[PDB]
Amino acid sequence: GEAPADRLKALVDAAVQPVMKANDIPGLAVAISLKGEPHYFSYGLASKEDGRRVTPETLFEIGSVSKTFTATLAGYALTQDKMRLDDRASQHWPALQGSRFDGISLLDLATYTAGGLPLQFPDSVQKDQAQIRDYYRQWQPTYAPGSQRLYSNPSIGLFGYLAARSLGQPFERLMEQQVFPALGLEQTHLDVPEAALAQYAQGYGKDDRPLRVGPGPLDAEGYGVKTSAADLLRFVDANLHPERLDRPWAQALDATHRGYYKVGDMTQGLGWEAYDWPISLKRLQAGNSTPMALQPHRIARLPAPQALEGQRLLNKTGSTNGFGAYVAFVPGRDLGLVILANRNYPNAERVKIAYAILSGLEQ
Ligand SMILES: *[B@@]([O])(O[C][C][O])C1=[C]C(O[C])=[C][C]=[C]1
Ligand SMILES: [Cl-]
């Protein structure tokens, strides 16, 4: 019958439409993987000025959702024995020898517990090898490595950069030439080709100023991916079924499904952040709140790494000045969701859309 497709469209419309109006979002793409089949719902405008509509092939900036791609490359380096999570960071970059990175592990970098590396590189550090080198050489922890989580682009960005060094090639090259092709992603870019630029949505900020992300230190590792809802759902489907990939890449994906510690309701993996499922909307919003991004939290370390599978929701938010992304999946239900928008609108609102869709699918 037409009832299932009508019901899914009604459910997704009902979740999305009020949140778009309420947050003045110009364009938004949803992709859902349900019972092994993809479903796409596209809303509004990729560019207000030329009237280009959002489609499942429109490219959006996904911001820190990029960290899950970075984690997958590190997973590859790890499961290929080029590095280990307990290595000291300075083992992989001689410039860091003699610095405080002699006493910081790769796991600490990956999971934001190196001792207070900040949210962003300071404005004084430009996209320049020498400036980045000098920044890390001089940095000193605020508190003991392994004790407090402070969400940090320099932290996980260094993790990704060191993973690339361990493999003997630049990060960006490894992503384009190995990771994206291994995952079957042809609409996923760190540097959008000229021929694909017509697909790149405009981002919108205050007063609807146009905003596309500019160069920054370790931008590729931290926040550099542009992709379509269709490709990001393919990445979600790879996460739901790593066994469908060639074994080295299956192992790399599996490495991102391991939890190391908890903060509140959240279990931290490499890239992915996990919750028990079901959990309340308010709790999932709280785990994705501004204090979780901006404030340090003492960790509760697990006795051994924990498999992030079964009745769990794995997620990641991502933001740039002009864009707001959210991805969530439930391994034990073969369910995945992607929500990409061209405004940076509050995380709580992204989670509201997702939760309405997931709730509705449960009924
Ligand atoms: B990232 O998007 O995380 C925020 C949403 O959870 C992020 C992006 C940065 O620059 C664009 C810097 C830090 C984190
Ligand atoms: Cl940064």
Side-chain angles (χ1 to χ4, degrees), residues 85-108:
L85 285 172
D86 54 10
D87 291 347
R88 303 306 99 177
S90 59
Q91 176 60 44
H92 296 287
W93 189 13
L96 302 186
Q97 289 184 247
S99 79
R100 298 298 291 277
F101 292 93
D102 287 338
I104 291 164
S105 72
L106 294 178
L107 181 63
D108 290 325

CSV table of all heavy atoms in Angstrom, one decimal, residues 85-108:
chain,number,residue,atom,x,y,z
A,85,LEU,N,47.0,2.8,20.9
A,85,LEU,CA,46.3,3.9,21.7
A,85,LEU,C,47.1,4.3,22.9
A,85,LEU,O,47.0,5.5,23.3
A,85,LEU,CB,44.9,3.4,22.0
A,85,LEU,CG,43.9,3.5,20.9
A,85,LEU,CD1,42.5,2.8,21.3
A,85,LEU,CD2,43.6,4.9,20.3
A,86,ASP,N,47.9,3.5,23.5
A,86,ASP,CA,48.8,3.9,24.6
A,86,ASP,C,50.2,4.4,24.2
A,86,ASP,O,51.0,4.8,25.1
A,86,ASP,CB,48.9,2.7,25.7
A,86,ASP,CG,49.3,1.4,25.1
A,86,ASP,OD1,49.7,1.3,23.9
A,86,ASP,OD2,49.2,0.4,25.9
A,87,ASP,N,50.5,4.5,22.9
A,87,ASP,CA,51.7,5.3,22.5
A,87,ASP,C,51.6,6.7,23.0
A,87,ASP,O,50.6,7.3,23.1
A,87,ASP,CB,51.8,5.4,21.0
A,87,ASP,CG,52.1,4.0,20.3
A,87,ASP,OD1,52.4,3.0,20.9
A,87,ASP,OD2,51.9,4.0,19.0
A,88,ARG,N,52.8,7.3,23.4
A,88,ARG,CA,52.9,8.7,23.6
A,88,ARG,C,52.9,9.4,22.3
A,88,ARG,O,53.4,9.0,21.3
A,88,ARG,CB,54.3,9.0,24.3
A,88,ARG,CG,54.5,8.3,25.6
A,88,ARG,CD,53.4,8.5,26.6
A,88,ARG,NE,52.5,7.3,26.6
A,88,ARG,CZ,51.5,7.2,27.4
A,88,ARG,NH1,51.2,8.2,28.3
A,88,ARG,NH2,50.7,6.1,27.4
A,89,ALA,N,52.2,10.6,22.3
A,89,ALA,CA,52.0,11.4,21.1
A,89,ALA,C,53.4,11.7,20.4
A,89,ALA,O,53.4,11.6,19.2
A,89,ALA,CB,51.3,12.6,21.4
A,90,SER,N,54.4,12.0,21.2
A,90,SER,CA,55.7,12.3,20.6
A,90,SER,C,56.4,11.2,19.9
A,90,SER,O,57.3,11.4,19.1
A,90,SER,CB,56.6,12.9,21.7
A,90,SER,OG,56.8,12.0,22.7
A,91,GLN,N,55.9,9.9,20.1
A,91,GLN,CA,56.5,8.8,19.3
A,91,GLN,C,56.2,9.0,17.8
A,91,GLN,O,57.0,8.4,17.0
A,91,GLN,CB,55.8,7.5,19.8
A,91,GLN,CG,56.2,6.2,19.0
A,91,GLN,CD,57.7,5.9,19.1
A,91,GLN,OE1,58.3,6.0,20.1
A,91,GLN,NE2,58.2,5.5,17.9
A,92,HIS,N,55.2,9.8,17.4
A,92,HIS,CA,54.9,9.9,16.0
A,92,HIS,C,55.2,11.2,15.3
A,92,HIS,O,54.8,11.4,14.2
A,92,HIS,CB,53.4,9.6,16.0
A,92,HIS,CG,53.0,8.2,16.4
A,92,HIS,ND1,53.3,7.1,15.5
A,92,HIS,CD2,52.6,7.7,17.5
A,92,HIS,CE1,53.0,6.0,16.1
A,92,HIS,NE2,52.6,6.3,17.4
A,93,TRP,N,55.8,12.1,16.0
A,93,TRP,CA,56.2,13.4,15.5
A,93,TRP,C,57.5,13.9,16.2
A,93,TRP,O,57.3,14.3,17.4
A,93,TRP,CB,55.1,14.4,15.5
A,93,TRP,CG,55.2,15.7,14.8
A,93,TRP,CD1,56.2,16.0,13.9
A,93,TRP,CD2,54.4,16.8,14.8
A,93,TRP,NE1,56.0,17.3,13.4
A,93,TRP,CE2,54.9,17.8,14.0
A,93,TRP,CE3,53.2,17.0,15.6
A,93,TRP,CZ2,54.3,19.0,13.8
A,93,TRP,CZ3,52.6,18.3,15.4
A,93,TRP,CH2,53.1,19.2,14.5
A,94,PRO,N,58.7,13.9,15.6
A,94,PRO,CA,59.9,14.2,16.3
A,94,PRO,C,59.9,15.6,16.9
A,94,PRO,O,60.4,15.9,17.9
A,94,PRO,CB,61.0,14.1,15.3
A,94,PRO,CG,60.5,13.0,14.5
A,94,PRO,CD,59.0,13.2,14.3
A,95,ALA,N,59.2,16.6,16.2
A,95,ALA,CA,59.1,17.9,16.7
A,95,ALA,C,58.5,18.0,18.1
A,95,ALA,O,58.8,19.0,18.8
A,95,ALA,CB,58.2,18.8,15.7
A,96,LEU,N,57.7,17.0,18.5
A,96,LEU,CA,57.1,17.0,19.8
A,96,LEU,C,57.9,16.3,20.9
A,96,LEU,O,57.6,16.4,22.1
A,96,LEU,CB,55.7,16.2,19.8
A,96,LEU,CG,54.7,16.8,18.8
A,96,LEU,CD1,53.4,16.0,19.0
A,96,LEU,CD2,54.5,18.3,19.0
A,97,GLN,N,59.0,15.7,20.5
A,97,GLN,CA,59.9,15.1,21.5
A,97,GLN,C,60.5,16.2,22.4
A,97,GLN,O,60.9,17.3,21.9
A,97,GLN,CB,61.1,14.4,20.9
A,97,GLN,CG,60.6,13.1,20.3
A,97,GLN,CD,61.7,12.2,19.7
A,97,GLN,OE1,61.8,12.0,18.5
A,97,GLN,NE2,62.6,11.8,20.6
A,98,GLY,N,60.5,16.0,23.7
A,98,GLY,CA,60.9,17.0,24.7
A,98,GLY,C,59.8,17.9,25.2
A,98,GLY,O,60.0,18.6,26.1
A,99,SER,N,58.7,17.8,24.5
A,99,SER,CA,57.5,18.6,25.0
A,99,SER,C,56.6,17.8,25.9
A,99,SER,O,56.9,16.7,26.2
A,99,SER,CB,56.7,19.0,23.7
A,99,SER,OG,55.8,17.9,23.3
A,100,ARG,N,55.5,18.4,26.4
A,100,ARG,CA,54.7,17.7,27.3
A,100,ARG,C,53.9,16.5,26.6
A,100,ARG,O,53.4,15.7,27.3
A,100,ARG,CB,53.7,18.6,28.0
A,100,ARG,CG,54.3,19.7,28.8
A,100,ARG,CD,55.1,19.1,30.0
A,100,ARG,NE,54.2,18.5,31.0
A,100,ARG,CZ,53.6,19.1,31.9
A,100,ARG,NH1,53.7,20.5,32.1
A,100,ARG,NH2,52.8,18.5,32.7
A,101,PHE,N,54.0,16.5,25.3
A,101,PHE,CA,53.4,15.4,24.5
A,101,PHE,C,54.2,14.1,24.7
A,101,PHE,O,53.8,13.0,24.3
A,101,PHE,CB,53.1,15.8,23.1
A,101,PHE,CG,52.0,16.7,23.0
A,101,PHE,CD1,52.3,18.1,22.9
A,101,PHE,CD2,50.7,16.3,23.1
A,101,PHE,CE1,51.2,19.0,23.0
A,101,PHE,CE2,49.7,17.2,23.1
A,101,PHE,CZ,49.9,18.5,23.0
A,102,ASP,N,55.4,14.1,25.3
A,102,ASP,CA,56.0,12.9,25.8
A,102,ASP,C,55.2,12.2,26.8
A,102,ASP,O,55.4,11.0,27.0
A,102,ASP,CB,57.4,13.3,26.5
A,102,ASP,CG,58.5,13.7,25.5
A,102,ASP,OD1,58.4,13.3,24.3
A,102,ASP,OD2,59.4,14.4,25.9
A,103,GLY,N,54.3,12.8,27.5
A,103,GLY,CA,53.5,12.2,28.6
A,103,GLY,C,52.0,12.1,28.3
A,103,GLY,O,51.2,12.0,29.3
A,104,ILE,N,51.6,12.2,27.1
A,104,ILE,CA,50.2,12.2,26.7
A,104,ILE,C,50.0,11.1,25.7
A,104,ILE,O,50.8,11.0,24.7
A,104,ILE,CB,49.8,13.6,26.1
A,104,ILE,CG1,49.8,14.6,27.2
A,104,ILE,CG2,48.4,13.5,25.4
A,104,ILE,CD1,49.8,16.0,26.7
A,105,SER,N,49.0,10.3,25.9
A,105,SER,CA,48.8,9.1,25.0
A,105,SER,C,47.9,9.5,23.8
A,105,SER,O,47.2,10.5,23.8
A,105,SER,CB,48.1,8.0,25.7
A,105,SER,OG,46.8,8.3,26.0
A,106,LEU,N,48.0,8.7,22.8
A,106,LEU,CA,47.1,8.9,21.6
A,106,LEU,C,45.6,8.8,22.0
A,106,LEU,O,44.8,9.5,21.6
A,106,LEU,CB,47.4,7.9,20.5
A,106,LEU,CG,48.8,8.1,19.8
A,106,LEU,CD1,48.9,7.0,18.7
A,106,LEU,CD2,48.9,9.4,19.2
A,107,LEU,N,45.3,7.9,23.0
A,107,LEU,CA,43.9,7.8,23.5
A,107,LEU,C,43.5,9.0,24.1
A,107,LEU,O,42.3,9.5,23.9
A,107,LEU,CB,43.8,6.6,24.4
A,107,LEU,CG,42.3,6.4,25.0
A,107,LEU,CD1,41.3,6.0,23.9
A,107,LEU,CD2,42.4,5.3,26.0
A,108,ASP,N,44.3,9.7,24.9
A,108,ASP,CA,44.0,10.9,25.5
A,108,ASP,C,43.7,12.0,24.5
A,108,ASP,O,42.7,12.7,24.6
A,108,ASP,CB,45.2,11.5,26.3
A,108,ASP,CG,45.6,10.7,27.5
A,108,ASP,OD1,44.7,10.2,28.2
A,108,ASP,OD2,46.8,10.7,27.9
